[PDB]
Design a protein around this ligand. Sequence first.
Ligand SMILES: *c1ccc([N+](=O)[O-])cc1C(=O)Nc1ccc(C(N)=O)cc1
Ligand SMILES: CCCCCCCCC(=O)O
Length: 258
Amino acid sequence: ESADLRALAKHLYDSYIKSFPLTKAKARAILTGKTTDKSPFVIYDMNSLMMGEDKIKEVAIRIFQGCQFRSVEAVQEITEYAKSIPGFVNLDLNDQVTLLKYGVHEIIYTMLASLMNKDGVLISEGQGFMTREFLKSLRKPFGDFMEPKFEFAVKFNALELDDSDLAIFIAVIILSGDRPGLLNVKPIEDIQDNLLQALELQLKLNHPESSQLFAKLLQKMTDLRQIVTEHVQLLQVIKKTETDMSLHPLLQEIYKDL
Ligand SMILES: *c1ccc([N+](=O)[O-])cc1C(=O)Nc1ccc(C(N)=O)cc1
Ligand SMILES: CCCCCCCCC(=O)O
């Protein structure tokens, strides 16, 4: 019944709003100049960077650590959203951990796109805006850290998803079931099947003139999978380049053996 899928969609959107404080709708209002929201301070060089902590350890490292800790914050919100996905907390505890371990970066980036346009990314819960060129201008290893996220976000944002779409899409991601190590795959797939049904109906209702958006959105799951695997290699590069730099353990466990 369509009715139960709508209720699932409504449930997930509600928990998404409750777990993610900077929605795509707010981020768009911030990025496009709307009077519901206030203007970000735009970091685009070192000096504007050094005025940012007024208004909102070398430069590239300082930024990379803020990105690092800003990532843990996202994992916490994602983990809290996950708990609301019906059936998730009833799964084998070890499979929960595995679903999160693998899903978290594909969801963090997917929701991260909401904060991006081709020019840069919202930072410090939308109060800041660090330009894409300033990030690309950073020293050798960190200079290329965020570029592939921007490239993805540009293509992803072209789908023009709203938060109510993303809430279901993100749940679909978490409940994959093709994740390595999963002890009991069938109840995960039963959940994902319901979510995908929910996602599909949601996209047809919310984007009726958007042909095959459902298919096109699932295909984007390929780009996410690429980003995450690409992202871990540059992590290993920096751990060996900067012996002195400390990756958060919560994040370390995410990359442990992929
Ligand atoms: C930055 C630097 C390092 C890592 N990492 O080793 O996992 C991750 C990041 C990163 O993506 N940080 C981030 C993600 C999402 C947001 C957000 N949605 O606001 C902020 C920062
Ligand atoms: C999106 C919040 C991040 C705060 C500033 C830290 C830099 C992270 C980034 O470049 O995305």
